[PDB]
Every structure is written in structure tokens, then in C-alpha cells.
Amino acid sequence: DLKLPRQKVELVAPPFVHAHEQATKQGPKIVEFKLTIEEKKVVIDEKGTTFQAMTFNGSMPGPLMVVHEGDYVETTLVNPATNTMPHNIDFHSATGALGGGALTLINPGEQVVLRWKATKTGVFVYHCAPGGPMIPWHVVSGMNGAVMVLPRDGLNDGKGHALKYDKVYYVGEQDMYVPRDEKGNFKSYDSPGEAFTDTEEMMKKLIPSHVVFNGKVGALTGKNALTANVGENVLIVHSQANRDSRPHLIGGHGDYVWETGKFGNAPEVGLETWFIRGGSAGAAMYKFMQPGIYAYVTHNLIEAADLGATAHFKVEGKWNDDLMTQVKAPAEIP
Amino acid sequence: DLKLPRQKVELVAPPFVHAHEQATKQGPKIVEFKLTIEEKKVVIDEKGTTFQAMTFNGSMPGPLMVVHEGDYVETTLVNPATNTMPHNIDFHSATGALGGGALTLINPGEQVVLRWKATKTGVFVYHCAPGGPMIPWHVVSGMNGAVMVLPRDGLNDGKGHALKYDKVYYVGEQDMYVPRDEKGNFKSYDSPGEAFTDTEEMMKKLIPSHVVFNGKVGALTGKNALTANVGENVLIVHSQANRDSRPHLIGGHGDYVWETGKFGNAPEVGLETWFIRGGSAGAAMYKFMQPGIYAYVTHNLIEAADLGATAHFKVEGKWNDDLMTQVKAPAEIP
Amino acid sequence: DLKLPRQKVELVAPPFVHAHEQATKQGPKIVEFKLTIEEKKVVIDEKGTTFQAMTFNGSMPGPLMVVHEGDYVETTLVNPATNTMPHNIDFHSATGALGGGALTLINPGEQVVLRWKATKTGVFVYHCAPGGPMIPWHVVSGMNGAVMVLPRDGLNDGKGHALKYDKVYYVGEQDMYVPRDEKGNFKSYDSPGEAFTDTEEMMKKLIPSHVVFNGKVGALTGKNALTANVGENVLIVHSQANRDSRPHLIGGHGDYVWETGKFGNAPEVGLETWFIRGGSAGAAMYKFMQPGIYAYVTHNLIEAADLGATAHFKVEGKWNDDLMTQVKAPAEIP
Numbered sequence A, B, C: 001d002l003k004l005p006r007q008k009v010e011l012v013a014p015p016f017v018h019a020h021e022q023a024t025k026q027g028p029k030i031v032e033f034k035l036t037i038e039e040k041k042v043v044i045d046e047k048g049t050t051f052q053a054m055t056f057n058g059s060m061p062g063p064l065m066v067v068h069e070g071d072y073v074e075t076t077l078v079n080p081a082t083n084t085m086p087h088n089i090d091f092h093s094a095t096g097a098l099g100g101g102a103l104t105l106i107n108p109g110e111q112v113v114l115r116w117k118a119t120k121t122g123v124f125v126y127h128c129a130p131g132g133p134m135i136p137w138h139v140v141s142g143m144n145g146a147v148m149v150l151p152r153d154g155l156n157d158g159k160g161h162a163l164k165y166d167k168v169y170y171v172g173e174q175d176m177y178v179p180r181d182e183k184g185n186f187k188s189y190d191s192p193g194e195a196f197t198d199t200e201e202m203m204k205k206l207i208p209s210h211v212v213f214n215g216k217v218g219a220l221t222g223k224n225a226l227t228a229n230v231g232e233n234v235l236i237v238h239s240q241a242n243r244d245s246r247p248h249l250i251g252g253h254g255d256y257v258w259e260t261g262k263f264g265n266a267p268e269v270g271l272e273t274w275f276i277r278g279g280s281a282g283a284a285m286y287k288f289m290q291p292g293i294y295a296y297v298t299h300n301l302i303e304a305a306d307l308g309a310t311a312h313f314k315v316e317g318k319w320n321d322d323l324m325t326q327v328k329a330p331a332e333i334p
């Protein structure tokens, strides 16, 4: 029935985002994406703790999909026979059938093709949701990502002015529940199925062992720090499919923030810390003013420093002594 | 002193809401309500776990009271001699005397009549609050509900347009703290008083055993699913008197959301997930576009699927293939 | 370089706030503050539990600093040799160098002078952040306060009208993690260093033993209740540097609330309960209408009544029977 142009997208792994237009002169298209599910044992911390992950496209989070209002998003979801469990996909951006979940349940060896019309603007979670107790389990095992539905005119500040980002990053935050043995050491398991009973018991107590960005402690640091230059406006999309978070850019601000993540609402301005409700994505833009290292955290600092939820930015440019200066370096008290 | 017309309301059990006008041509009235406290042992899950509940009018939540701005709400609170504890009522909608609590403490065998002027619009929690450590205990035992204070012109979108709902439901969410024995089984108690010491010990650790809507796992499912038709605008009032929640309609959206719950503020539009602060009520309206089953959850999915916090809607009407379609059903991967 | 007038401020202990102008005709100044760090063992509850606190200026929270937009805030941070640990300061109001943290690390015996330009309006957290796991530890040991950056025209309601407070209070909320021995009694330690291992173990489990205002259970009660008169507009700044909170004035409202705390955004109106994201300050103003006692709580009532997070207001003036009246005092049920 649907006679619109088709456009394929090559997804890229987080924190990066596939190339896209903000404002566009294109009309509605059918935008084609493929997600291939991978169950895999991964390392989640610098001590070598392992984790039975379940992923879209091999990553935690799943990749960010970007379209415009009124596009149709046509996703081929693939569950190779090398996996063990059924899986599906629920898009919080979509209308009907439990977000798509009720139309996309696939066993290992199967694939399905779902299309949904992007009638709601903003950033949105997508996640697996097979049914019943498997819903939380698949999500906290890593099976969640996000989609961004941009207005065709790009972003605005609510107050007729355009808001154009120079780059966008996607920070997916994951609460993880790794049980401990009697000794006190994290357990390892041979399969997701084998991990389930201990992992569910822990899940129901509502305290994660790890809270990470991009799948691992320290993922968005070192060589893989986020980057910017003084003068660049950076959009940071943050999602959390199961649990609240409170993002904060240490040494910066949220110049324009959509903490509930939906572009039909004006952004708030000049925030210190914002709030991502579990089950949502939000977005914050900041124009960097100072060079150096920044930390991007959830501002439960226990979670940030001790459980894994810290990213860095390395920013190049000229220091601004008007905005901040060390008037007197550390010295003995007179 | 107060020479206004009197109108009696027949309260109805949640999730339903007593009949009322949205926009009205009536002026201020004294609106009369009666709440009769019932302490009772109830079943809270499908395994037969019991719970020492304390209720207004026999239900968890207490019933939704609906009035208009500038009405006077005159409540007869009754504590029959068949109860064991003193009780009172605090309305977050009311001004003075700890919300009414300091004027309504009644022993078993007593009743009291409180009137308050509805000067604040929105949805608001009401709850018992006897004093000291009894405050949390009575609330988490079930002694909380909500009141809705509508503008006389009905609801609006902030942007001069009216927002009329076709039906309203009240979802009261309850965090419950049921201790376990050494075996690991939930305990049962012969009285609220007997439950108190174990229950307080658990409460202070801040992790509920159950998180339920309408008093029980599965209460708002099966025969008792919420209902709608495609085309109907449904208002969903959600309250949580003690603990945060993050509502989400799976397969839908919040078209217009007052997450802080107060009609003097414009609603936000197009939300995926919203946030009910513990100690508050909020409200979301959605116009259904697709038939079928929806789940209405808190989007801590552990809480939703594993601890009790899932409701269903069953929606009738015609499927819209433009909004969503299964392009290719599950098939073997080529 | 910077040729502006200098003004010294004499800080005062919370909940009070040093004298300041709301609207001002002054232009930018260099506003001088001194903070002297004190590590000390303190009592945190009415049972005599002790706690290894780390403070700015001897108090939990640290004192509220008040300036205007475009001022330069020049802080002399002093770490006397009588302390044991290095410390620094991070201002969420400031731009660059991890909020100042990367320019203010001082060993015992040292001081440093940092200046930052107040380019963002609102209330903001400041806290110590030495590095790594020490960050959460120093914060939850008490090393956090707030700064308020007022517009030069004072506050407004977003809707061209001025919002002038008659008084302001600063409520700093502190999550504390005091371990227990095998007996079940809270432990005491001889130094912060000695407390660290047990305290970190507890911290990572994310459940505080105490949640207090102004450093201690009951601090803002009795002789030290907050006060007001009927007719007075009171601004209540609330901060939480590590963990969410949900403030509520029992028997009142938030007439004008900036829950995210930033004056570039209009306030919300008529709230029952608001939300302070961990890592932030927010503010609420209320004009008292009724005399008597009010409780100001976080509306996790377990935290409020059982873990320490309750303040009182004692309000003088004439009772308003129009707003609320006890129509019939407690009596036997007919």
C-alpha cells in the first residue's frame, strides 16, 4: 500500500550516531534498519567480572536509530539460530501492539519485519519484552537502545529559535545484577539460562551490582572518552530502560534540556543535573566554553564512582580566565 | 456561617470514579463525602500472600473524590469500634492543620467532620498520618487515596484549548512491606499490631516486597482490565503516597501529562514515561488509536513484572496499518 | 586583570542565610567568601549515634552562598593542618575545571583561592570531590552545600510579575551510611579513615541508615523549628548532593516551585510535592495562610518519620475558618 521512497541506514555502535540531517527538505520516507540480536558473555568491569548479556547488534546500549517526524521506520529484527532464547522489540516511539512487541516475537532462527509511523517527536527507548518475568530480565541483560525522531525543521528552543548541534552522542545507562557467591565474589555462568535463577532473585531486591555506560565500567574513557572543542554544541542523548538516572556534566551545564525527552515540549535552560525516568530517554545540549577533562555522570556519586557510571569528555581549546581562574595556587595557610 | 448549597457524593471503588462534571456552570458548593475506615487482612498476590491492610472505605487506594475549584469538601471520617487503632486524614489539597490531620484524629468508635476549601487545582494525595512512626506505617498499610480538584472550565492544554476526557480511571500504586521468615516464606500476622515490629524493620530498609495497583497483583487485569475504544480520550490519575513511580502505557503515550499533577501548570505533550513523586498524584490523558491489549506499568520493569505493578487495557476498534504493520511475519532467516 | 569592586560576605550557619538583596542596582562585583574545612565526629540522632563528618565551615550542609548573575565568586578554601585528608571544592554553578575541583585540591595545612563567574542563575550544589571513590565518600560524609545566583531584577513568576520572599531558609538533606555491628548497633569510629572501609561497603548497597536535615535528626525542630507568620512568603532552598528527595510542606503547598532549581525557567505553581534530583538544589516559595505547626518532609514517609528527614515550621497568626474548619469535633458514632 505504502508508496514512499526507501532509504537504508547503516547503524553505528554507541556512543556514536549514524549520519543524519537535523532540519531536512525531505518528505516522509520508509527508513530501513536491521537489528541482529546477539547473546554473549562479556566483561563489565576492570576486575574481569563477566556478565551474560543479551544485545541488539552486539552492543549495550543497542544503537541509536535516527529518523524524522512522519517517517516510517521499517526494522528487520533477526534472531540467529546461534541464540538460545526468543526475543522481540518494543519501540516507545510507536503506536499499537505493545510498541511492536506483540508483532515481533521470534525464535532462534527467525526474523520479522515491523514498520511503525514516527508520529511522536523526541528520543525514546526501544527494548525487548518477550512476556512476563522475561521482560525485566531481557532488558537488564542489555536488550535496550533508543530512537530519535527529529522535527523536520530541526530542534528549537521554544522561544522561535533554532538549536543546531555540532555532534551528538548516545549514552545508554545499564543497571546490571550480578550475583555473588558465599565468598563474596561475583559469579560467572555458562549461559543466560543458567544465570537466570540467581539473577532474578537479585533483581527483585532492586539494587544493581553495576551501573555502567556503554556496557562496561570505563567504556567512555581513555582512548574512548567523548570529545569536543570549545565552541561546539554537543547533544547528549541519555537512556535508561529500567531505572532512574540523574545526569550531570561536571564543569558544565545542560544549556537546553528535555529531561522527559520529547521535542513537542520546550527545553528547560541552564540545568545542573537532570532526571531520566526509568523507561525513557532524555537529551541535553551544551556548548562547551572551557577546555580540559569533564566527567559525565549520574549524580548518585556512589553509582558514578563506585558502580561504574562515569564517562569523560576531553575538550580542546583555550582556557577562559574570565569564567574561572585559580587566583592563588595551593599554599601554606598564613 | 457558610451558606452554600450542599451536594452529596456516592463514592465508588477504584479504579472507577464517581460521576462528575468537567466544565460546570455550578458555583461553589459544600460537597459531602463519607469515608469509613476498615482494617482488614487481605490477599495481595496470586500465591495467597496475606497482608494487614488499613483502608479508607475498604479499598486500596481509597476512592477518588472529585470536586471543583472553590468548592468546600466536607468529609465525615468514621473509625468504627471494630478497628484497633486511631486514624486521621491529611489532604494534600487542603490548607492548614497538617492537611486536616491535626483536626481529625479519631479513636475506634468515633467520627469527625472536617471541611476544607478547594483552593488548589489538580490531583492530590490524601492519607492517614496519626503521628510519628505511625505515619509511614498507616500509609504503607494502604491508608491513602486521592482527590481531584477540577477547574470550573474543565481542563485545558495551556495552548486556550479544551481537553475533555471520555472516561477517567484512578490507579493507586501501593508499596507493601511483607516480612519473610527464615524459610524465605512471607509471614502472616493476626492483627496489624502484631505485624508492626517486623513490618517496621523491613520498611526502614526501603525495599518493598510488592508494588501493586488497586491493592493486589493482577487487580486491573482479566475481567477487571481497564477498557477503552479507539477514539476515546482516557484520563489516568496515578498516585503514590510514599514512593516514586514511573508510569508508562505500553503501546501508547501520554498525549497530555501533568506529572506533578497540578492544573495551574500546562500539561507536557507526547511523553513515553512520566514520573509520580512519592507523596503525590499525577495525571495523563491519551486518545487511543489502536485496538488490542495494552499494559500500563511502572517502568521499573522488575517492579512491573515481578513485584505486581502491571494493569491492562483492553481496547476495541479497528487496527490502523498506517500507524503500525507487520510487514513480514516471523520466518526462517534466508 | 579584573578591576571590579570587592565585597566580603560573613557566612552564617544553615538553615539561615546571610543577608542579601533580591533585586539590586549594583553591578557585578567580586564577592569574597571563606570556607574552612572541618573533619569532626558528631552526633546524628537522638539515641546518640555518632558519625565521622567532613564539613565546610563546620556545618552540614555547608552554608548557603548568595550572589547575583554576573558577579564573580572568589572563595578562599582552607584545609587546616588539624584535618587528615585532602579536600577540594566543585561548584555546580561554575564553568570549567570540574566545577573548580581540578583547581582546589589542598592538603591539610594548605589553602587555595578560586574565582568563578556566576553566569547561570538558580540554586546549585557545591561539594568536595577529591577524585575516584573519595568523591562519594566525602560528599556523603557531609561535604556539600549550595549557592544561590539571583537575577539582578530578583525573582519572577514567568507570567512579568515579581516574586519577593520575606525570608529564605536553606534545608540541606544528607543521606548517611552508618554501619552496624553483628549485635545490630551502629558502629563508632576513631577517625574518618577508620570508618572508610565499612562505610564504603554500606554505601555501595545504596540504602542510607539516616536521612537528615541540617546534620541531625530533629535539627530543625523545638527551639530550632523554622518560623513564619501568616502572610509571609518564605523561600525554601532544598539541596541533596547525592540522592533524590521529594519535599513536601504538610498543610501547605509550593506556590511557586523551581524543582530543577534554575531561574531561567518559570516556576511551576500550586504543587503538593516536588522533586530534588540527587546532585542538585531546588527552591519553593509559599505564602503562609494558616497558623500552627507544619512539618516539612521528604515524602518518602519512612525516611521522614523513621530515618530523620522531618523539619517543623511554627507559624503565628489568625486561623482561617474559611480555608479549613473542624465542623464537628470527634464524637461517638451515632
Ligand SMILES: OC[C@H]1O[C@@](CO)(O[C@H]2O[C@H](CO)[C@@H](O)[C@H](O)[C@H]2O)[C@@H](O)[C@@H]1O
Pocket (backbone or CB within 6 Å): A151, A156, A157, A158, A159, A160, A263, A264, A265, A266, A267
Ligand atoms: O520547543 C517546543 C515548544 O515551542 C513552541 C513555541 O513556544 O512551538 C515551537 O515548536 C513547535 C514544535 O517544533 C513548532 O511546531 C512551533 O511552530 C514552534 O513555535 C511550543 O508550542 C512548543 O511546546
Ligand SMILES: OC[C@H]1O[C@@](CO)(O[C@H]2O[C@H](CO)[C@@H](O)[C@H](O)[C@H]2O)[C@@H](O)[C@@H]1O
Pocket (backbone or CB within 6 Å): B151, B156, B157, B158, B159, B160, B263, B264, B265, B266, B267
Ligand atoms: O494549562 C494551564 C496553563 O495555561 C495557561 C495559558 O498558557 O492558562 C490557561 O489556564 C488557566 C488555568 O486554567 C486559565 O486561567 C487561563 O485563562 C488559561 O489561558 C497558563 O497561564 C497556565 O499555566
Ligand SMILES: OC[C@H]1O[C@@](CO)(O[C@H]2O[C@H](CO)[C@@H](O)[C@H](O)[C@H]2O)[C@@H](O)[C@@H]1O
Pocket (backbone or CB within 6 Å): C151, C156, C157, C158, C159, C160, C263, C264, C265, C266, C267
Ligand atoms: O521566570 C523565567 C521565565 O519567564 C520568562 C517570561 O515568560 O522570562 C522572564 O524572566 C527572564 C529571566 O529572569 C527575564 O529575562 C525576562 O525578561 C522575563 O520576561 C521566560 O522567558 C523565562 O523562561
Ligand SMILES: O=N[O-]
Pocket (backbone or CB within 6 Å): A248, A249, A250, A251, A299, A301, C090, C092, C098, C099, C129
Ligand atoms: O559535580 N560533581 O559531581
Ligand SMILES: O=N[O-]
Pocket (backbone or CB within 6 Å): A090, A092, A098, A099, A129, B248, B249, B250, B251, B299, B301
Ligand atoms: O514498553 N514496555 O515496557
Ligand SMILES: O=N[O-]
Pocket (backbone or CB within 6 Å): B090, B092, B098, B099, B129, C248, C249, C250, C251, C299, C301
Ligand atoms: O502530608 N503528609 O505527609
Ligand SMILES: [Cu+2]
Pocket (backbone or CB within 6 Å): A054, A086, A087, A088, A128, A129, A130, A138, A143
Ligand atoms: Cu530479548
Ligand SMILES: [Cu+2]
Pocket (backbone or CB within 6 Å): A090, A092, A127, A279, B248, B250, B299
Ligand atoms: Cu517499555
Ligand SMILES: [Cu+2]
Pocket (backbone or CB within 6 Å): B054, B086, B087, B088, B128, B129, B130, B138, B143
Ligand atoms: Cu490510619
Ligand SMILES: [Cu+2]
Pocket (backbone or CB within 6 Å): B090, B092, B127, B279, C248, C250, C299
Ligand atoms: Cu502527605
Ligand SMILES: [Cu+2]
Pocket (backbone or CB within 6 Å): C054, C086, C087, C088, C128, C129, C130, C138, C143
Ligand atoms: Cu573533602
Ligand SMILES: [Cu+2]
Pocket (backbone or CB within 6 Å): A248, A250, A299, C090, C092, C127, C279
Ligand atoms: Cu557534583
